[PDB]
Design an enzyme around this catalytic site. Structure first.
Site, short mmCIF file in Angstrom:
data_model
loop_
_atom_site.label_atom_id
_atom_site.label_comp_id
_atom_site.label_asym_id
_atom_site.label_seq_id
_atom_site.Cartn_x
_atom_site.Cartn_y
_atom_site.Cartn_z
N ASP A 39 0.80 -1.23 0.00
CA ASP A 39 0.00 0.00 0.00
C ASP A 39 0.83 1.27 0.00
O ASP A 39 0.25 2.36 0.00
CB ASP A 39 -0.99 0.05 1.16
CG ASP A 39 -1.85 -1.17 1.24
OD1 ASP A 39 -2.16 -1.74 0.18
OD2 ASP A 39 -2.22 -1.55 2.36
N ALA A 40 2.15 1.19 -0.02
CA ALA A 40 2.97 2.38 -0.05
C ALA A 40 2.87 3.04 -1.41
O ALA A 40 2.43 2.45 -2.39
CB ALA A 40 4.42 2.04 0.26
#
Ligand SMILES: [Mg+2]
Ligand SMILES: [Zn+2]
Ligand SMILES: [Zn+2]
Ligand SMILES: [Zn+2]
Lengths: 44, 58, 58, 138, 64, 76, 50, 463, 1044
Positions: free
Chosen positions: I680-681
């Site tokens: 999710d970065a």
RNA sequence: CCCGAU
């Protein structure tokens, strides 16, 4: 010591142990004047 | 909250920090990147033993 | 295996063999720990810290 | 810079320095300095008979002529609308020339853009003469 | 707050195009072709005027 | 003579555990080291050269014991 | 009412028509400037009612 | 901080970088169960030199590559690396010596900068000479010339061809000989976590654990460098149904609804036969579910037939990087019946699920079926039933961890003081024997191979 | 048929959002203080019966404040927020009683009616919800509690069909639960005053119906299962020869811990009796009738207690405490305002202390509801408005009876996954009313009770029995005429719009509810298949030539609660109208709340991804109000350059969210880049952050007050201590300014002093220093008196943070992400027209989360900016993809948005096309500067000598007992001694060999002989265990041994 | 105790 009123914005020279009321008002929220020193800021 | 379950077993610990994590694939699987500001605070007492004398002096 | 969740039998071969080695099946509750362990502080670090410490002073 | 109401001041000195754009993006001499390969569009099949004006509205407007002729390919933005047509997508292969691109420099206004590019080449040459003099030391 | 004087993606000087933009919307000019009159070709510099709200004329009211 | 002739991972840890702490108190080093300043990195150089002055005292749980030199074991 | 850094950041993004390669880089910290490295500007605005 | 297994504390060597985040390699994030969505995790620093070695040897990442439940590896590629290395080892890719020496030379930093990296000779010579993708993935397993790794692996893969051992055109059959990928493409099941025949597990058992951690830290450096220059990207073109889905879903929604209109009518208006489980109005619903799951899976098969290759959610589903083929049918074709705890949605009102339908309606799309997929967007009743079935996921994770946290506590507060003594017996703290040998054979479940056998002799003999 | 959405912005002007908080308080001021005087007049005493104190009225004036004897000046609410006062008005021959705080935008607050020009001189934001009291400077909301209904026959399943009516006394003194149990086939009437589960026929003979023929005739005349009432109890009654009415009061007269004619009034209370118990018997008989014929979470049963209903629970009690102490004074000084003015302390410091500390501690009603009030979260705009529409519970799963009343997707996760709900848009909680014309039309329309034979009210179909508010009011043969006639009457307007007639046919009870607190909602009436709006009406509302309340009296819009929705055939749209439609639906996006509803296309995402955003929408970092610069709050996050979203919904315009937005909208390009975007970065670029993409402004607040003591000395603020020069300390008093308070417009490093608050013991200075980690600039310094005038001084500390690695961004679809990498701009995949991205998003967030609504915002946004238009993506509608996609083609773009890029690093074009466009990325308040933490060795706690808890107290994070087992399972023994004795509690203690016990230092006091005493090494927490074990009589007698 | 993070 010079303070600025709540909405009257008149410079009121109070002294210590003085109520914080105002000339030409009664409002008791008194902010302080901005400093006089050279403040260096960085544009990054 | 009592001394058994929280002060004798689960006790707070010195030399320990906590930040938010973010990825770094450019490390080996065995390495964590530690920030500088944390690494200047968390310290390891390394005794002086004829091999780290010049390293600890430096 | 019904929930996916594969597991070695050698873990369950240990958990069952602990649970039934003192005569009868000793379920791992608060009550089964008293019939499994002799030492007090291991019982006292578990539930019922009041009674297990006074009864072992009696 | 800012807005004011009466009784308010702004008093400040500034200092300007010479900075690389990669240090901070306020030093960037150029708005966009992108480039793009010049497209060339080849009709493999001759197109005519109202399919030409079908292929006209399919591409960018100025790119085409009406039979169908690919008049001026340089103005083509890659919408890729041909593949929606289901008939002309087998007709024309679209392509971009590899060694023929189109630069588009638009300066902010510090230096005129014909002196931005001639400075941009001048510091790449300086970046490799900086290294060629490292090998002369060693 | 106030108009950011750059585009965030490219960095076209866009802070000097606010009152020139508001002067266009005062006339008949539609929201679309007002930004085509100011020379805003790509959309990333177009959203800096379109999606911007001007709180600084509203905060000033509450700042004697 | 009856236990496993393989150095377990719990024996390699403590042998590296105490030979690191011994060599961090100026112990005599057995490997003519090459600039390693971490005392733990010296100890793995001691293990691979198989020169550690340590004998593991392995306790069978009845109370009897069985010694094992770290020279006399099969590391991984 | 504009905050100090956000003013000082918005003074940063303004481009400046003085061309480089007349000047040089700033060597040390050197916050005083040497008139061969820097280029100072003044901004004095105080508004009243007309 | 929610430590759930042994692998939540792991040691790490520490390199002082320039930021305030704890940055680690993303292969080791499934042991931590740590995503990077704002998660925090603690860092203890052991002080004595004895506790420094007990971290490095026992709890190092190079030691605990393998979870002690199964023996499976937990530290292996996640997300992009899997969909990077699948797209690289896919049969279609071909690199020239331009791109081949560029992808390969990404793997030369940090203990790897001192090797004479040997590009293999190219697999096309005459008309143009160019490498293949799998030949560059072999550089991960054996970059140098004097590297002693010879990895061997032969296995099935996802989307397996069913017939044909390794020669069919689907090419989902991995064969590595001497650390050279000879055929097949790297799925999740040959690179990810959970499979006992991925290469990082095979490199672990056969060639030590330093070569498994190096080949895993090679792929994490190599596979983004390929993918960021190949540009894997998702879009809404990757979700729009083609022409073939719509005429397939329209008939399946009609012919699936004619029968369910009749199966309801065969119950109440007349006589309906009964399944042996219960009476009518209970087997009707179990016969409703059969015809609705016919719809979502034929349209789910109508979607997957027309879905063109190099589609981004399809490519992320072939290699098991993210999301299965169920999610593609939900996004594109039709998301099926929304079930609440194993049934159609219960009537919260009187004899009716929501006041839009009629009383005593057992109709589909009145008791929880959603007909529109996520592309065409849910409708207000359909969006509510998907929310109702969605919250049972969220509610149950709140209450399960309220129980399995306790069940973790009771378990470890009885079972903590056992250790296999030196004469192979497993005793309690008080000396009393629980097991005479641990688990009959005295074998680690961690080191144990698949099928609960330490060897799996077919693999070792071919190796 | 075309335009009916216009009813919603007309409903929101009247009674829609945060107006249900206000009207409920405006009911409490303007009605409920004049219904407590009618209950509590006539203050009489026994020591003198010839005087009398009689209240006539209470008026509650305008908010004022005195600072001296008789200044009595008024106050703006943003002065009480600064001077830490409490915004309150006096309570009032015509003399004051106390002071009660006023919620903002109430009928007696200052802010109502006044224009935005007048909001400036009052220093208050016009886009500010109101509905929050300002108590002691902070601003508290009374959260909406949900209770179950009052006097409800609930048929539960404890063992087999137990039914208990939780009657609530209209005379509010008590609330009793007269449940009915079944033991071994016999019914009983368990209570909390009864010492025994007494059989029910004992009660029935005690209630006046003595014969047994009457009792069955009550329960069941049709016998089929009510014959099995027979050998259960009336035989069990008859098995002991106890047929007598007076004798069967006598068995009650024993167990109740002639005297029970009265104490049967404290059983099933609200069925009223004037010693004519016939009405009481049927209600008990109907309670038995349910059991023999035999949903706790269903929202016809859940009534909501608002802020004005909940204060009337307090003020009635605080008036009584004021009332009874007048009796305690008048019975003290007689063997009268002048002994009453000091009881102005009673109401004022009673009411205020109940709101600030959220405790109704009311022993008079036996209720101890904790945490009723909450401090407002001024993080963003909608984190304030998301608190105004909030419901706290007292099940977790979503019920479909919450359709249209509550938001399905707006909930927390964690402890409160379905227990803290949020009100939807078009709802309305009801207030109470009189029951006069309800009964008066009931008895005309046809009902009869207390004269009908026991048998009538039974299995016969034509016996629907009318129930109002839980009290039986007769029986009607024809249910339809009654339900229809009341409904026509309500639509005509003779009966109050809110009252609801519902019918349950399973048990023949119609239910007229005038309860007050019912969740309600409006719908468009469908008489025959043509609706009633008629379009032309939707045009009247267009010019204003008509108001939403004219729709009600014209019988075009009906208010429906949850109970009436059982009897309706709500059509969602126009095109789903059937033969029996009944009501229609105004605008179906109103089932979403105000934290969702912000989301564009919520009907395309997976539903557990909208719920993630409803948490993160409140956590957004944006602008707060137009008075955001004059507020001095404890933590205020501000964005530098906010931008309204490119894809707005329709709920955003009604909230006026775009008037004060939160978050920019950056040109993302969803593609996988550089491998620093895995979990999710998301990669940002170091040019947008240099151009000002989401510069933060985190505003702390430090304060002090200088109180005059009882010693009559006071605090001083003496200036800096210049040393060897006018220059102040080495950096310590450098910013002081010579008046004490630091100077505004100046930077504060760590450990620099803000004020020199010096305290009298003689003066010890308590310098208020700024800790922080980074530097902060003073923006304002305010100076005022509080209520007890003691010179308060408040600072305000700027800090701007460009978002660096760690700072959490979300994406308006619950796909949050720490910014993993910040690349330079020239390393980033520019497209053809030059646009390099800002936020490269990973494409693996999509196929598992199935947030397709994000993929359309990159399409609806990208077509939106190119046309100069804001595309509506609302819920269940908005701009479709088939018309957005043909707008990219006009501007020469790909019709899906996937634009051909060339890579920034290598210079060759990318192998696949990259999706590309502007989506609304909101920065939210989890920046790593507030969370970076390390503790080397610092303060230890005074009791247990372990490191403290918290980063504010220099931290130390608990290696918990779950992580103890991880360290056990590794087999690391010497680590655990190091990690739980060496670097946590490294203590040293002395015990003795014989009599082994802790003896201090060199020798042990028991057996003074000093010889055996040998030191141990132990954790301090274990030493504190031994020493507190030995304090009670458990003595751990250690027996040492030497190290072997 | 509330709130919020995971
Ligand atoms: Mg997480
Ligand atoms: Zn004034
Ligand atoms: Zn731009
Ligand atoms: Zn002694």
């Amino acid at each position: 010591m010079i303070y600025i009123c709540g909405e009257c914005h008149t410079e009121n020279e109070i002294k210590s142990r003085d109520p914080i009321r105002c000339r030409e008002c009664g409002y008791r929220i008194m902010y302080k004047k901005r400093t006089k020193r050279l403040v260096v800021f960085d544009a990054r | 909250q009592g001394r058994f379950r929280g002060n004798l077993s689960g006790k707070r610990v010195d030399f320990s920090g906590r930040t938010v994590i973010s990825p770094d694939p450019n490390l080996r699987i065995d390495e964590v990147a530690v920030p500088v500001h944390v690494a200047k605070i968390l310290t390891f007492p390394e005794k002086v033993n004829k091999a780290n004398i010049n390293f600890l002096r430096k | 295996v019904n929930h996916g969740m594969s597991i070695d039998r050698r873990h369950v071969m240990l958990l069952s063999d602990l649970m039934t080695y003192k005569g009868e099946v000793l379920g791992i509750t608060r009550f089964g720990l008293a019939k499994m362990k002799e030492s007090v502080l291991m019982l006292a670090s578990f539930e019922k810290t009041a009674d297990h410490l006074f009864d072992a002073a009696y | 810079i800012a807005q004011l109401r009466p009784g308010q001041e702004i008093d400040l000195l500034m200092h300007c320095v010479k900075g690389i754009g990669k240090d901070h993006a306020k030093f960037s001499p150029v708005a966009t300095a992108s480039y793009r390969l010049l497209p060339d569009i080849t009709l493999l099949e001759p197109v005519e008979g109202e399919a030409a004006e079908e292929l006209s509205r399919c591409f960018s407007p100025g790119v085409i002529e009406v039979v169908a002729r690919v008049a001026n390919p340089r103005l083509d933005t890659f919408s890729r609308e041909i593949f929606r047509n289901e008939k002309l997508k087998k007709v024309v292969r679209l392509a971009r020339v590899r060694d023929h691109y189109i630069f588009s420099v638009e300066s902010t206004g510090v230096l005129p853009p014909d002196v931005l590019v001639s400075e941009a080449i001048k510091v790449l040459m300086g970046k490799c003469r900086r290294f060629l003099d490292e090998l002369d030391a060693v | 707050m106030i108009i950011p004087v750059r585009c965030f993606t490219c960095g076209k000087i866009v802070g000097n195009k606010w009152e020139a933009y508001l002067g266009l919307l005062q006339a008949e000019y539609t929201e679309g072709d007002a930004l085509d009159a100011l020379g805003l070709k790509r959309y990333c510099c177009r959203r800096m005027l379109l999606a911007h709200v001007d709180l600084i004329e509203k905060l000033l009211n509450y700042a004697p | 003579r009856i236990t496993t002739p393989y150095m377990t991972k719990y024996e390699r840890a403590r042998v590296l555990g105490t030979r690191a702490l011994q060599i961090a108190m100026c112990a005599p080093v057995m490997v003519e080291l090459e600039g390693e300043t971490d005392p733990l990195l010296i100890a793995m150089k001691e293990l691979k050269a198989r020169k550690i002055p340590i004998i593991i005292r392995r306790y069978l749980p009845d109370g009897s014991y069985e010694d094992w030199g770290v020279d006399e074991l099969i590391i991984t | 009412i504009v905050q100090d850094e956000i003013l000082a950041h918005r003074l940063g993004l303004i481009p400046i028509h003085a061309d480089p390669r007349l000047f040089e880089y700033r060597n040390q910290g050197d916050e005083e400037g040497t008139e061969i490295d820097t280029l100072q500007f003044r901004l004095q605005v105080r508004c009243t009612r007309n | 901080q929610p430590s759930l297994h042994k692998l939540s504390i792991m040691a790490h060597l520490a390199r002082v970088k320039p930021h305030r985040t704890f940055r680690f390699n993303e292969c080791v994030c499934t042991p931590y169960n740590a995503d990077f969505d704002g998660d925090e995790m603690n860092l203890h620093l052991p002080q004595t030199e004895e506790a420094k070695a007990e971290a490095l040897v026992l709890m190092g990442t190079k030691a605990n590559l393998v979870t002690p439940r199964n023996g499976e590896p937990l530290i292996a590629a996640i997300q992009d690396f899997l969909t990077g290395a699948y797209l690289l080892t896919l049969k279609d890719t071909f690199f020239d010596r331009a791109k081949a020496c560029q992808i390969i030379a990404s793997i030369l930093v940090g203990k790897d900068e001192k090797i004479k990296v040997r590009l293999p000779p190219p697999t096309i010579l005459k008309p143009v000479t160019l490498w293949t993708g799998k030949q560059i993935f072999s550089v991960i397993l054996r970059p140098s010339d004097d590297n002693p790794v010879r990895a061997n692996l032969r296995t099935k893969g996802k989307q397996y061809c069913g017939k044909g051992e390794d020669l069919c055109a689907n090419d989902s059959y991995v064969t590595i000989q001497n650390s050279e990928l000879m055929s097949g493409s790297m799925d999740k099941g040959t690179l990810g976590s959970g499979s006992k025949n991925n290469i990082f597990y095979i490199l672990l058992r056969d060639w030590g654990q330093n070569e498994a951690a190096d080949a895993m830290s090679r792929l994490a450096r190599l596979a983004p460098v390929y993918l960021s220059n190949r540009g894997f990207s998702i879009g809404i073109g990757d979700v729009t149904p083609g022409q073939g889905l719509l005429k397939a879903k329209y008939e399946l929604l009609n012919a699936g609804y004619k029968k369910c209109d009749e199966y309801i009518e065969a119950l109440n208006t007349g006589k309906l036969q009964q399944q042996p489980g219960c009476t009518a109005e209970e087997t009707l619903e179990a016969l409703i579910l059969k015809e609705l799951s016919v719809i979502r899976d034929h349209a789910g098969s109508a979607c997957l037939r027309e879905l063109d290759k190099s589609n981004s959610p399809l490519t992320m589903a072939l290699c098991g990087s993210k999301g299965s083929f169920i999610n593609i049918s939900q996004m594109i074709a039709c998301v099926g019946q929304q079930a609440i705890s194993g049934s159609r949605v219960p009537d919260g009102f009187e004899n009716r699920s929501l006041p839009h339908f009629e009383k005593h309606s057992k109709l589909p799309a009145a008791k929880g079926f959603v007909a529109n997929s996520f592309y065409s967007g849910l409708t207000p009743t359909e969006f509510f039933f998907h929310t109702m079935a969605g919250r049972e996921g969220l509610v149950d994770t709140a209450v399960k961890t309220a129980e399995t946290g306790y069940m973790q506590r009771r378990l470890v507060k009885s079972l903590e003081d056992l250790c296999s003594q030196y004469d192979l017996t497993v005793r309690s703290s008080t000396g009393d024997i629980i097991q005479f040998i641990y688990g009959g054979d005295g074998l680690d479940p961690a080191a144990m191979e698949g099928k609960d056998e330490p060897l799996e002799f077919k693999r070792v003999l071919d190796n | 048929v075309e335009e009916k959405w216009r009813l919603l912005p007309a409903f929101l002007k009247v009674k829609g959002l945060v107006k249900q908080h206000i009207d409920s308080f405006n009911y409490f001021i303007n009605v409920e203080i004049k219904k407590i005087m009618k209950a509590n007049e006539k203050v009489t005493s026994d020591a003198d019966p010839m005087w009398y104190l009689k209240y006539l009225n209470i008026y509650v004036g305008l908010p004022d404040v005195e600072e001296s004897f008789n200044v009595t000046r008024p106050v703006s609410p943003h002065e009480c927020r600064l001077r830490d006062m409490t915004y309150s008005a006096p309570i009032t021959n015509a003399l004051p009683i106390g002071r009660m705080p006023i919620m903002l935008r109430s009928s007696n607050c200052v802010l109502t009616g006044k224009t935005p020009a007048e909001f400036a001189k009052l220093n208050e934001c016009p886009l500010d919800p109101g509905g929050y009291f300002i108590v002691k400077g902070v601003e508290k909301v009374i959260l909406i509690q949900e209770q179950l209904s009052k006097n409800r026959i609930i048929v539960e399943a404890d063992r087999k069909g137990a039914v208990g009516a939780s009657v609530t006394s209209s005379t509010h003194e008590k609330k009793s639960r007269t449940n009915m149990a079944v033991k071994q086939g016999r019914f009983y009437l368990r209570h909390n005053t009864l010492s025994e589960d007494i059989p029910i026929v004992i009660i029935f003979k005690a209630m006046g119906v003595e014969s047994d023929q009457e009792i069955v005739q009550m329960i069941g005349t049709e016998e089929h299962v009510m014959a099995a009432f027979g050998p259960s109890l009336e035989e069990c009654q008859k098995a002991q020869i106890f047929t007598q009415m007076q004798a069967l009061k006598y068995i009650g007269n024993k167990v109740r811990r002639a005297r029970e004619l009265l104490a049967s009034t404290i059983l099933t209370h609200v069925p009223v009796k004037e010693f004519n118990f016939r009405a009481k018997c049927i209600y008990t008989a109907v309670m038995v009738r349910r059991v023999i014929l035999a949903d706790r979470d269903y929202y016809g049963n859940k009534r909501l207690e608002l802020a004005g209903q909940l204060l009337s629970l307090l003020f009635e009690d605080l008036f009584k405490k004021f009332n009874s102490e007048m009796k305690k004074i008048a019975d003290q000084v007689i063997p009268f305002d002048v002994v009453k003015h000091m009881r102005q302390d009673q109401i004022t410091n009673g009411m205020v202390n109940a709101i600030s500390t959220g405790n109704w501690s009311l022993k008079r009603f036996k209720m101890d509801r904790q945490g009723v009030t909450q401090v407002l979260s001024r993080l963003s705009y909608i984190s304030a408005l998301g608190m105004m529409t909030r419901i706290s519970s007292q099940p977790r799963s979503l019920q479909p009876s919450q359709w249209g009343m509550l938001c399905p997707s707006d909930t927390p996760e964690g402890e409160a996954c379905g227990l803290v709900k949020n009100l939807a848009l078009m709802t309305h909680i009801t207030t109470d009313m009189e029951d006069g014309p309800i009964v008066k039309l009931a008895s005309n329309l046809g009902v009869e009770d207390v004269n009908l034979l026991c048998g009538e009210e039974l299995s016969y179909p034509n016996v629907f029995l009318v129930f109002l508010n839980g009290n039986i009011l007769g029986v009607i043969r024809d249910h339809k005429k009654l339900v229809n006639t009341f409904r026509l009457m309500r639509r005509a307007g003779y009966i109050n719009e809110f009252v609801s007639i519902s019918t349950n046919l399973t048990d023949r009870c119609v239910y007229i509810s005038s309860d007050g607190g019912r969740l309600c909602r409006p719908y468009i009436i469908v008489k025959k298949q043509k609706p009633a709006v008629t379009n032309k009406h939707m045009e009247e509302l267009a010019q204003g030539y008509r108001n939403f309340e004219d729709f009600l009296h014209e019988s075009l819009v009906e208010y429906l609660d949850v109970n009436e929705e059982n009897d309706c055939n709500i059509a969602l749209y126009e095109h789903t109208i059937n033969k029996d439609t009944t009501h229609l639906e105004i605008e179906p996006f109103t089932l979403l709340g105000v934290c969702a509803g912000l989301i564009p296309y919520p009907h395309h995402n997976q539903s557990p991804r909208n719920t993630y955003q409803c948490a993160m929408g409140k956590q957004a970092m944006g602008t707060i109000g137009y008075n955001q610069r004059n507020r001095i709050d404890t933590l205020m996050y501000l964005l530098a350059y906010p931008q309204k979203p490119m894809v707005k919904t329709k709920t955003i315009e009604l909230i006026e969210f775009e008037k004060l937005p939160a978050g920019q909208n950056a040109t993302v390009a969803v593609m996988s880049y550089s491998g620093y975007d895995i979990e999710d970065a998301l990669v940002l670029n170091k040019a947008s952050l240099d151009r000002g993409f989401g510069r933060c402004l985190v505003y702390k607040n430090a304060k002090c007050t200088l109180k005059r003591y009882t010693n009559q000395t006071f605090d001083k603020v003496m200036g800096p201590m210049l040393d060897a020069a006018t220059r102040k300390p080495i950096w310590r008093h450098e910013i002081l300014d010579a008046d004490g308070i630091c100077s505004p417009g100046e930077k504060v490093e760590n450990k620099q002093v803000l004020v020199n608050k010096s305290m009298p013991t003689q003066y010890k200075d308590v310098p208020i220093t700024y800790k922080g980690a980074t530097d902060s600039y003073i923006e304002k310094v305010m100076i005022s008196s509080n209520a007890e005038d003691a010179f308060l001084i408040k600072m305000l500390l700027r800090q701007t943070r460009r978002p660096e690695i760690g700072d959490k961004f979300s994406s308006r679809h619950g796909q949050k992400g720490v910014c993993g990498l910040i690349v330079p701009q020239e390393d980033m995949p520019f497209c053809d027209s030059g646009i390099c991205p800002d936020i490269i998003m990973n494409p693996h967030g999509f196929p598992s989360r199935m947030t397709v609504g994000k993929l359309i915002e990159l399409l609806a946004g990208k077509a939106g900016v190119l046309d100069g238009r804001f595309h509506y993506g609302t819920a269940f509608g908005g701009s479709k993809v088939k018309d957005v996609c043909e707008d990219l083609v006009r501007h020469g773009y790909n019709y899906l948005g996937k634009d051909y890029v060339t890579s920034g690093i290598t210079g060759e074009p990318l192998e696949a096309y990259i999706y590309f466009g502007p989506v609304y990325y909101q920065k939210l308040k989890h920046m790593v500067l507030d969370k970076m933490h390390a503790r080397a060795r610092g303060p230890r706690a005074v009791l247990t000598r372990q490191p403290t808890e918290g980063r504010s107290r220099d931290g130390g994070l608990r290696l918990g007992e779950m992580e103890r087992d991880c360290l056990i399972g590794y087999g690391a023994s010497m680590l655990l001694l190091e990690r739980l004795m060496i670097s946590s509690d490294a203590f040293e203690v002395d015990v003795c060999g014989q009599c082994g016990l802790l003896g201090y230092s060199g020798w042990c006091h028991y057996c003074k002989s000093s010889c055996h005493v040998s030191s141990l090494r132990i954790p301090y927490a274990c030493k504190l265990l031994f020493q507190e074990l030995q304090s009670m009589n458990i003595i751990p007698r250690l027996k040492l041994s030497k190290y072997n």
